[PDB]
Structure formats: C-alpha cells, structure tokens
Design a protein around this nucleic acid. Structure first.
Ligand code: CA
Ligand code: CA
Lengths: 236, 239
DNA sequence: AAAGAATTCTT
DNA sequence: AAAGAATTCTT
C-alpha cells in the first residue's frame, strides 16, 4: 500500500543517506547545527521528494500549504477520492542518548473547527499520519571534494510512520501554544502503536474537550482515567 | 571595527553565494522549501562561519547556546573582558514583493530577569545586534539532484537582503506576537532598518517600555499601548 | 491591531 | 507536570 511503500521508502532513504550540510549553486557548503530547529527543517526537506515519489506511484496528488501556519505538511489524494484525503505531518524530537515525546499539533484549531488553519476542511481527511524523526544530539565552510569531512550533528536518526490518534497521549505537548502531546515512550512503542486511546473517536473527543490549564482540568479531567470516569458519569 | 567588518563580511557573502539545497555525504542534494521556517534555518547556518571568521580576526570567542530555547544565537567576548559581551541574533522575514517587520524576541524573559533563557546573564552583554535577512518569496521541487546539477536546482527566494543593526534601534512599540510575547520591530522599509530610523529616544527607553508592557489589551488599557502612552505613563509617575 | 495559529523545548 | 520559554506568521 501507499502507506507500506511510504514507510519503506523513508526507512530506506534514512539508511542510505546522511545529510551533512547546506550547499550553494557555486558549490560552497556550510555545515549544519545540532538543534531541532535545524534538524527538523532538514528532515522535512529530506522527506519531501520521497513522499512525492511514492504518492505519484500510487496516483495521489501531493499538496503542501500555500499559507504558512497551516496543517498539514502534505495532503495526498487521488482525484477520485476527494473526501478521502490523507494528511501527513513531519514531527521531530531528539534524544541525548531513552524515552521520547512529540508535540502533535494544536488541540484548538482544525480539530475543534473544520476549516480552522487547515488546507482542506477537516472532514475531507480520512487519515492523519505522523512521520516522526528522532535523533541523538551530537564553523568552517567546505567544498564538494570534502563531503565526508564534514562533521555530521546527530548520532543516529530513526523514522516511523504512524497514525496520530494512535501515538497521541493524554497530556498537552505545550502550554501557551496549546499542543497535543504524544505518548512518552521508547521508539518501539511508536512503531508498534502502543498508545493510550482505544479509538480515533476517543482521541478526538478527549482533545476536543481538554481544558487549557491545570486549574480547569482539575475540575473536568486531566488524564485518560479521569476522562473515562468523566464519560462514565455523563460528561459530569 | 568588529561591527563594520562583520557587516562588510555578511554583505559580500550574501552577494557571492546562493544557497540552493541540503547535501548528503553521498552527494545527493535535496531542494529547499521557500517558507521562513526553512529559510530562517538556512540563513543562520549561512552566517555562522562568517560571524566566526570575523570574530576570530578581532580576538573574540564565539559561543552558541547549549540549550535550545536560549538567547542569543551568538555570544562574542574577549577572554580578558568577559563582562563586555556582544549578543548577535539572526532574524528573518520576507517580502511578498516594501515595508517589512521582524519579531525581536521575548519581552518577558532575560529583559525582565537577568538570567531567564539567556546563555550569560543579561548584564554581561554590552550590545545586542540583530542580523536581519529579508527575502522576497518566490511565487515559484520534489525531486533530488546530484553534484553536477547545482545550476538546475530551483532557489526558494527571488532576492535576499541582509543588515546588521542594534536591537533597540529597530524596536517598535507594538508586540511582534500575542501568546508568545515577542517584541515587534518598526514596520518600515529595509532602508530604515539599515539606517536605524527607529522610534525610541534611547536604549534605556526601549528596555523600560518592553519591561513594563502588559501582555494583553485589557491590561495595557490602564497603562500604555504605544510610545505616546508610555511617555504619558512616565509623566503620571509610572502611575 | 490584537490575539492566537504554526513547531518543540525546558525549568 | 505545568507553565512558559525559543521563532514567525496570519488574521
Ligand atoms: Ca505541519
Ligand atoms: Ca511543511
């Protein structure tokens, strides 16, 4: 399937190539920094041609946002299945050596409002996948004949393709910017889909009614157990 | 000086090189995106060796943050004069085609707390420079390339302009962001950023304004929302 | 504008 | 944890 092929292609490109710098049209290369700010940009760029290659091979047209501040990174869809769009987001985090966690987008935009900050209305998508990259964190300019001399910036890099609701956790990924938090676990649990929600509807419901601060949550629900007791009582 | 040489260096580099893609140790090149999230990263990496050469010429040690949410991008200091450090931050914005604006960092962090989210206590910095890049967004690749196709890789910008200017000099009186409490710059033509045609009387005034600026309109309504109101707040007795 | 989206990290 | 830091943008 598109999905199986996509993750094979990503996993494979990852195994075969090591990004080591930025290059200019004149052939001047500048090394890369070791922060997620840099690496996430690089990992997104590394992924783009792979995504487009696999999608085309499956007849899906790929679309990226025209406006900055819009979800998702890539919207795929064959013209015959307009209401069966698939949203793919690229997420990154790091490790110093170990469990990981990702921020999974806002819980106050498109999930609460069909057209809010999303390329196509929320209800036209049938899948929201997360291409997650994890790297172990590790001054001159170079020439092409120096490609392997350039110090690389990451010790390892792992990639997975998993459904968003599936790796979604019950605690906010960030405060002031209201992000959904992932599960906090080892890489394996993301690949295996060992999350906390039983269904995509439970994920959506939980985050569509999650309150912004502990103050509030303390009277409704803060975690999954409390949310289920909250559901049990009648949303009481 | 360090400053003039740095500015000199940046202009020449930006003039000599057009960044076009990321390269892997194996020679495969991936094109760049044309959004600020990408370009800002590209611009910073482009500046770093240069900032480093120049700093070396003038006997300055360059230090970058160890943690990820720390100001500034680069801290320069003579080993002999640790308390006369220079903070250099790289900011980026674009022109769709013209007046521009930048976001100049938090107004609730290190400026309100000597050690909040800053590599070295704020009081150890004697200057805070901003290297600003402005690129025109290309109206308009998902292919990869090889070392011999450099010229065919499409560039994510029509034009790029860079300047070095003090932070206070280009600061404005309206927030650069809401929820993330950022200082906003003057909304003006590139020329004014280069020429330092700002709004504050001094750096002392810049800092005081941003240190006493309220987070949301409601709050600001009983204090000040602009430079005139701040000047009036001052007269009233910071009352 | 003022407020709140877009991404991820740290104390 | 939470809450709020790092950046830039949209309306
Ligand atoms: Ca996205
Ligand atoms: Ca993107």
């Amino acid at each position: 399937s598109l999905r199986s092929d996509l993750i094979n292609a990503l996993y494979d490109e990852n195994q075969k190539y090591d990004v080591c710098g930025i290059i200019s049209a004149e052939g001047k290369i500048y090394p890369l920094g070791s922060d997620t700010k840099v690496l996430s940009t690089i990992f997104e760029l590394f992924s783009r041609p792979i995504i487009n290659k696999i999608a085309e091979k499956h007849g899906y047209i790929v679309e990226e946002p025209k406006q900055q501040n819009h979800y998702p990174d890539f919207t795929l869809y064959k013209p015959s299945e307009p209401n069966k769009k698939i949203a793919i987001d690229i997420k990154t985090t790091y490790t110093n050596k170990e469990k990981i966690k990702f921020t999974l987008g806002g819980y106050t935009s498109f999930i609460r409002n069909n057209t809010k900050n999303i390329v196509y209305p929320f209800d036209q998508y049938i899948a929201h996948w997360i291409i997650g990259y994890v790297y172990t964190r590790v001054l001159k300019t170079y020439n092409i004949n120096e490609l392997n001399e350039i110090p690389k910036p990451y010790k390892g890099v792992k990639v997975f393709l998993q459904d968003k609701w599936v790796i979604a956790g019950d605690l906010a990924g960030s405060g002031n910017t209201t992000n959904i938090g992932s599960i906090h676990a080892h890489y394996k649990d993301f690949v295996e889909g060992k999350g906390i929600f039983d269904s995509e509807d439970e994920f959506l419901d939980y985050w569509r009614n999650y309150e912004r601060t502990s103050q509030l949550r303390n009277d409704k629900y803060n975690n999954i157990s409390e949310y289920r007791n909250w559901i049990y009582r009648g949303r009481k």
